[PDB]
Design an enzyme around this catalytic site. Sequence first.
Site, PDB file in Angstrom:
ATOM      1  N   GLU A 105      -7.179  42.063 120.299  1.00 48.58           N
ATOM      2  CA  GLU A 105      -6.646  43.062 121.191  1.00 48.58           C
ATOM      3  C   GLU A 105      -5.503  43.758 120.473  1.00 48.58           C
ATOM      4  O   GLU A 105      -4.824  43.095 119.703  1.00 48.58           O
ATOM      5  CB  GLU A 105      -6.154  42.348 122.449  1.00 48.58           C
ATOM      6  N   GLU A 109       1.959  48.293 126.830  1.00 45.43           N
ATOM      7  CA  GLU A 109       2.203  47.869 128.203  1.00 45.43           C
ATOM      8  C   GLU A 109       3.471  48.464 128.799  1.00 45.43           C
ATOM      9  O   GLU A 109       4.566  48.556 128.225  1.00 45.43           O
ATOM     10  CB  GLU A 109       2.257  46.305 128.310  1.00 45.43           C
TER      11      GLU A 109
HETATM   12  C1  LIG Z   1      -3.595  41.308 126.470  1.00 39.95           C
HETATM   13  C2  LIG Z   1      -2.893  41.330 127.838  1.00 39.95           C
HETATM   14  C3  LIG Z   1      -3.646  42.046 128.952  1.00 39.95           C
HETATM   15  C4  LIG Z   1      -5.033  41.525 129.301  1.00 39.95           C
HETATM   16  O1  LIG Z   1      -5.546  40.341 128.610  1.00 39.95           O
HETATM   17  C5  LIG Z   1      -6.989  40.116 128.737  1.00 39.95           C
HETATM   18  O2  LIG Z   1      -7.539  40.979 129.747  1.00 39.95           O
HETATM   19  C6  LIG Z   1      -8.969  41.057 129.833  1.00 39.95           C
HETATM   20  C7  LIG Z   1      -9.314  42.188 130.814  1.00 39.95           C
HETATM   21  O3  LIG Z   1      -8.380  42.266 131.917  1.00 39.95           O
HETATM   22  C8  LIG Z   1      -9.488  39.653 130.192  1.00 39.95           C
HETATM   23  O4  LIG Z   1     -10.825  39.586 129.754  1.00 39.95           O
HETATM   24  C9  LIG Z   1     -11.837  39.678 130.721  1.00 39.95           C
HETATM   25  O5  LIG Z   1     -11.881  38.541 131.551  1.00 39.95           O
HETATM   26  C10 LIG Z   1     -12.917  38.649 132.570  1.00 39.95           C
HETATM   27  C11 LIG Z   1     -12.857  37.284 133.318  1.00 39.95           C
HETATM   28  O6  LIG Z   1     -13.453  36.263 132.548  1.00 39.95           O
HETATM   29  C12 LIG Z   1     -14.369  39.024 131.942  1.00 39.95           C
HETATM   30  O7  LIG Z   1     -15.224  39.576 132.959  1.00 39.95           O
HETATM   31  C13 LIG Z   1     -14.274  40.097 130.799  1.00 39.95           C
HETATM   32  O8  LIG Z   1     -15.433  40.082 129.980  1.00 39.95           O
HETATM   33  C14 LIG Z   1     -13.103  39.801 129.905  1.00 39.95           C
HETATM   34  O9  LIG Z   1     -12.925  40.845 128.958  1.00 39.95           O
HETATM   35  C15 LIG Z   1      -8.757  38.474 129.447  1.00 39.95           C
HETATM   36  O10 LIG Z   1      -8.927  37.419 130.365  1.00 39.95           O
HETATM   37  C16 LIG Z   1      -7.238  38.635 129.070  1.00 39.95           C
HETATM   38  O11 LIG Z   1      -6.852  37.834 127.934  1.00 39.95           O
END
Ligand SMILES: *CCCCO[C@@H]1O[C@H](CO)[C@@H](O[C@@H]2O[C@H](CO)[C@@H](O)[C@H](O)[C@H]2O)[C@H](O)[C@H]1O
Length: 214
Positions: A105, A109
């Site tokens: 990633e 933010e």
């Molecule tokens: C890096 C800080 C902000 C968000 O971190 C990551 O966010 C993702 C999307 O909000 C999340 O990944 C998703 O999780 C869901 C639940 O399992 C899945 O449907 C999807 O494929 C996945 O990309 C992460 O959990 C998180 O680290």
Amino acid sequence: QTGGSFFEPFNSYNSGTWEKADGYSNGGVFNCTWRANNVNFTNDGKLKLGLTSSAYNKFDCAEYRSTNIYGYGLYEVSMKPAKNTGIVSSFFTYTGPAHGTQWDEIDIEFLGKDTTKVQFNYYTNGVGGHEKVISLGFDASKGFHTYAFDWQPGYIKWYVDGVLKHTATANIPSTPGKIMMNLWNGTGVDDWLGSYNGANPLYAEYDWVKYTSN
Ligand SMILES: *CCCCO[C@@H]1O[C@H](CO)[C@@H](O[C@@H]2O[C@H](CO)[C@@H](O)[C@H](O)[C@H]2O)[C@H](O)[C@H]1O
Ligand SMILES: [Ca+2]
């Protein structure tokens, strides 16, 4: 290898583009269920993500995600975050186990608690902890400003309104990911985000997105 340059104006929905998260919570520290119905496109052509109370201390939030994956190149958003404690407004690239890869990633933010500041972070294969709070000399939330990061193999650059704000130099992400925007409130992290005070509806506006491949 992957996804080519595009330019998103947000006036026409069409297939094989973007998908909304719906009916599930990411859990942990995201204290809201993703609602497809909290992703609204306006008639002037801006995605409008929202935070709303379904029930009293039960909130729903909003996520949008690209169907394809994107690599190395220039990433640009015109966006207006939500100001309010205990929330985040973001635009990032993501892949994860979730997608069958190393969790890579990079991100921008806006912590609702201070929107005269932005947080630049990235994660290579699970290790992140690279957060840079830059102070933009304005309120991000009084208007539309452009936010870029140049993801490259050697460095990641970050730009606010065409001004270089941060470069990253050691262990840069190398897996192509989805472009993702969202608005969510958090639990546990009172420390980073502040405490969400229950206030709603909140919304972050996204005017356009452009990815320029190499
Ligand atoms: C890096 C800080 C902000 C968000 O971190 C990551 O966010 C993702 C999307 O909000 C999340 O990944 C998703 O999780 C869901 C639940 O399992 C899945 O449907 C999807 O494929 C996945 O990309 C992460 O959990 C998180 O680290
Ligand atoms: Ca638009």
